[PDB]
Assembly symmetry: C6
């Protein structure tokens, strides 16, 4: 539908652009939260990968724990050659894994250098465990700075319960424009993966949980 | 004199539930989890005052920028920038302990300058979170409510909560120092979401009880029979 | 020399449940979540005492202003300003400008002597308590004992955050009080149901469990169970 | 098979549930939420001792005044003031006038026990003093030494404690039951808007007792327990 | 393959497939009045009466006098055994290593093979400290070659095995005594949660406490 | 190269559930409440490596003494003493003298690895030194460094940790699963008055696996898992 207020870019992730009514809001950050092994990193990568392959939009991936080499190695599970894209200057993996102000400028520099339209930030809450009010302000500053740059950003966060707080510090969903929840629910000894778009400021979207699978082709969502 | 009188919100179904609207000269707490429609409720309250009654409004925002408020309001067919240019709406940027005492006098300037009868305060929780102490939150919120009452503004103020059926708000005190409490819920059941609105209390006047289903549409909040 | 006597509240249904009303000379805790009717109960207690028995009352407010108290009471067709003007009611403002327990108690005593009040309602003492469970326990204990010396029959409101959880905020209030009333506002299947319970009345009898009630244009009405 | 001796409470039903009454020369913890009948159990225990057996009793109170104890007991037609005048009952007042010392309190209790030649003791409100210790470890050791001292005097003691949940911890600090020889739990269970009073003997060291909850009522005659 | 010693507690040796592993520590955890002390006592008493294996009982809160008096209700004369030198009740009711040394001395002096440690949880006021202290105690008893029953407390029937959430991880063997409320009735059950290096029956088995001690029915 | 390759555990049913075994050169976290079979899984991993593929193994123990490990494995008919005597299995006692330095341990581990030419490593009881810290942030960082150091040596590692609830957090500090590449959960669930053991592979980074819980028993031949 054209009659929505916020311009969106397509993830080209199957089923997600339907649920989000067109993709992710351009120039804004989308929180992607979930328990362990829910597919947060995969979503973040597939966002960048599809952007490059489909639209030749350069991407910057910021990682806080997983090494660039593990990211590249793990992506081969889906037939994606990220090293080749890194070689072409179409993908840049920014290694922030051994101050958030200095980091923001590193990202800013990479975005300008590589002319990136899409940004994924994976594992930023590992920097918080280092108070909810402090988390809230720092995230708020990061989101605002990314917006001023004009980046369209996916940022992952962690949660420890399938049905409970959106993320660890109970403030993350409130300073984000957009919130996506990945679940991996255990019921009667079986797991089922779901994705929910909890909110998208300024636009409609499908509500509730929608089933998805992770396969050799990445994330497949069925709305 | 009379029992407290009410101001019509013109939000479909709400004036029915509230038996006339929001109590005049007082603040109404509107609490909910993330993306429940709190900002929308606050905006629609002001927007309807301007369009339907030519009552000017002041919107106070703590985190969301004025430009984003305006842009997001276009989703509901509302041209806030036009209202700002006509001087019928003023958006006060409260983004950066935080001095709520200094803030309220800036709000007063705007109220007097634009002759506002309706005020919406969105995101005061972000300030309360610095406090991170129930006793301080209670005291500061009490003073804020008291100062607003002195001005005579009819006010909607939003707050956050983290559970659909737990505490009214974050610090377990907000509902006790508010005259009026509205709870917006976004309940997940069987993988589907169901939005509801409840008027928990209105001091000194009557209202319908329990939860009432609503949806958010291209025309804003729509509360069902 | 004999069993504790009771003072009638004239609150529709309560004197039945309480088997005569509130125990004379003692304080009754009325606890509830937000908007359960705690202030209304406290006010109706004084209002009925004035109107039915010509017993003067003192209302102590810690947050809500006297003006608001009066304004909100007009919802029930009650003219509190009149009762204040006639010297039958005093609203004692202990609320802060937009804590000394001893100073407050002497003000209450002064007011009780000045207006010859037999009934007292204290609304919002919780707000000063939040400024340690055992500090709260000791302060509350002292307030109760002091009111007892004066001979006041007192309604005292407190807050709770769950319908089926602790009686009040600090887990000690009910153990210090002689009498405990719980107001509930239970949400079940998107519908709210108000109930009143007399949990405890020291040295006397009372009906048990929850009894449904409503708040109407003329105050609290309590009905038979179920 | 040498049995632990017991003394009868004469509280209707209880001596059946306890198989003879309360273990002699030991302390029995009586825990419950608000208005569960803890003080009533404490008083009825002393009152029956005096009336039925001519055994003097000492009631130790920490919050409720002797005058209120006496006043409230008239609800059941008991004249405690008369018993105090006869020296059959002594209400020891430890209530505050508007870190306390145990050793002072116990020597008071000890003196009162010796003076009135009391065989039964009820201690009511000791939780109030364990509440700004407000530390489980501290409460445990202080309560332990209190029990040990009472045992030396040879007093058979009922001591009340508080709990804030019907089916949660035995008492406030999760330690009180572990340092008591005997534990009784009074419950006031709310189910479907109705209340149900129950008494349970959770444990009696070294002796037998009936298990689980038994319904009781409080009437003009005090506590009446049913099977 | 692992040698076990018989508790001779009715039904228990069946549940443990032959008794408690010799030279190992067994945690016996439960809420108040679940039969922890009774289990500890029977373990030593049976070892003495039937196998002439001396025992040491270590008590932290309950006095030796009360332990003796309470055991008498089961017809067990512990005073005779302590006077015969077959049993030693170590009053640890006045520094864990000072305790350890006293235990060791008693074991050596009385040539004890069974040890019951009852109420060690009262020593603690930090889970890491508790874990470290308990591990040292267990390790030392193992080096001595003692077979040990060690009681601990819990506050809920279903939840943490013991108070500090570490006790079950430092013990070789874990036994849980439950006293579960089912519609106003109590039901006693015993469960062996783990026995390192050997098999055992799984889950809960009902028992009663009678004039002859613990009576477990594994059927 | 391509997708991450896997090393066969030869544990009955597990290689089916993991679609080929444990990811080579990486650590797999194995979490469970008390007596769930974590040490057994760790031992059986090394034992099968030695017997089936002649791949030497190193077992790092933080609590159980080496002799207890050997003695406890005898109920499964595994002669671990012989394997130690042959130099095929090295048990590394990492218990502190009856707070901890990871880099010192990695050296001892690395040395043992080179010396015994070990393909497989099991680390059992590292949670005990994590409690010394009692801070999720500290635990998270320390574990992260352990995983990275182990990766640098190229060891395929089983790493046990603890939890106190069958259906609560994966491990103690709520961070362990997030810095691990691979996560296995052993459960021991009450069914009426009976117990039911289950194994779940929660995640394996960069590769596939079966989902949910699968029942297993512990017998005289160790762990036997039942898919289908
Ligand atoms: N080829 C594949 N086929 C099927 N499932 C796969 C495949 N490759 C990976 N997966 C799944 O994808 C998961 C990894 O997803 P991730 O995106 O790394 O999750 P994550 O939320 O980032 O978890 P973390 O970062 O480790 S907490 C694995 O646990 C597998 O379940
Ligand atoms: N045109 C529309 N049609 C339907 N739903 C819409 C439309 N526009 C917005 N929404 C919904 O409105 C939500 C946002 O409403 P808000 O009032 O901003 O909620 P909120 O409680 O203020 O959330 P915060 O401040 O981000 S925590 C979005 O998440 C959408 O679900
Ligand atoms: N005329 C009326 N008819 C029906 N209900 C009314 C009327 N006037 C007020 N009420 C109700 O009474 C409630 C207020 O009762 P209060 O006694 O003020 O409760 P409260 O427990 O003191 O709440 P606090 O102090 O604000 S937390 C309102 O929320 C209404 O639901
Ligand atoms: N004559 C009576 N008939 C029936 N019930 C009575 C009578 N007298 C008192 N009661 C009940 O007994 C209760 C008081 O029992 P108590 O022994 O004081 O309880 P409690 O556990 O000591 O409460 P505390 O100390 O205030 S927390 C009252 O709440 C009544 O429900
Ligand atoms: N002769 C007996 N006949 C029947 N049951 C008995 C007998 N003696 C004791 N009991 C029961 O056994 C319980 C005491 O068992 P213990 O082993 O002392 O419990 P415990 O777990 O050690 O509790 P603690 O140490 O007080 S927390 C009593 O509460 C009775 O229920
Ligand atoms: N021969 C056997 N037959 C059946 N079950 C056995 C046998 N040998 C051991 N077991 C079981 O294996 C369990 C021990 O498994 P472990 O791997 O040691 O568990 P664990 O998770 O390491 O527990 P910890 O470290 O003590 S908390 C015992 O509790 C028994 O239930
Ligand atoms: Cl999947
Ligand atoms: Cl909607
Ligand atoms: Cl009503
Ligand atoms: Cl009753
Ligand atoms: Cl039994
Ligand atoms: Cl098994
Ligand atoms: Mg990831
Ligand atoms: Mg908003
Ligand atoms: Mg009120
Ligand atoms: Mg009492
Ligand atoms: Mg014991
Ligand atoms: Mg192990």
């Amino acid at each position: 539908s054209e009659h929505q207020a916020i311009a969106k870019m397509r993830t080209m992730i199957e089923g997600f652009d339907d649920i989000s009514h067109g993709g992710l809001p351009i120039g804004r950050s989308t929180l992607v939260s979930g328990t362990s092994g829910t597919g947060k990193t995969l979503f973040s990568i597939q966002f960048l990968y599809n952007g490059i392959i489909e639209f030749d939009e350069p991407g910057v991936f910021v990682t806080f724990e997983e090494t660039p080499q593990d990211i590249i190695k793990n992506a081969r599970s889906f037939g994606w050659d990220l090293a080749k894209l890194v070689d072409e200057g179409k993908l840049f993996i920014l290694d922030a894994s051994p101050d958030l102000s200095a980091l923001i400028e590193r990202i800013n520099y990479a975005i300008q250098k590589y002319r990136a339209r899409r940004v994924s930030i994976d594992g930023v809450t590992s920097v918080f465990q280092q108070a909810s009010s402090v988390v809230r302000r720092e995230l708020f500053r990061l989101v605002a700075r990314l917006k001023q740059i004009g980046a369209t950003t996916v940022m992952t966060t962690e949660r420890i319960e399938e049905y409970g707080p959106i993320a660890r510090y109970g403030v993350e969903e409130f300073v984000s424009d957009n919130v996506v929840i990945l679940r991996n629910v255990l019921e009667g000894e079986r797991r089922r993966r779901t994705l929910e778009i909890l909110k998208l400021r300024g636009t409609s979207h499908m509500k509730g949980e929608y089933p998805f699978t992770i396969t050799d082709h990445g994330i497949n969502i069925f709305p």
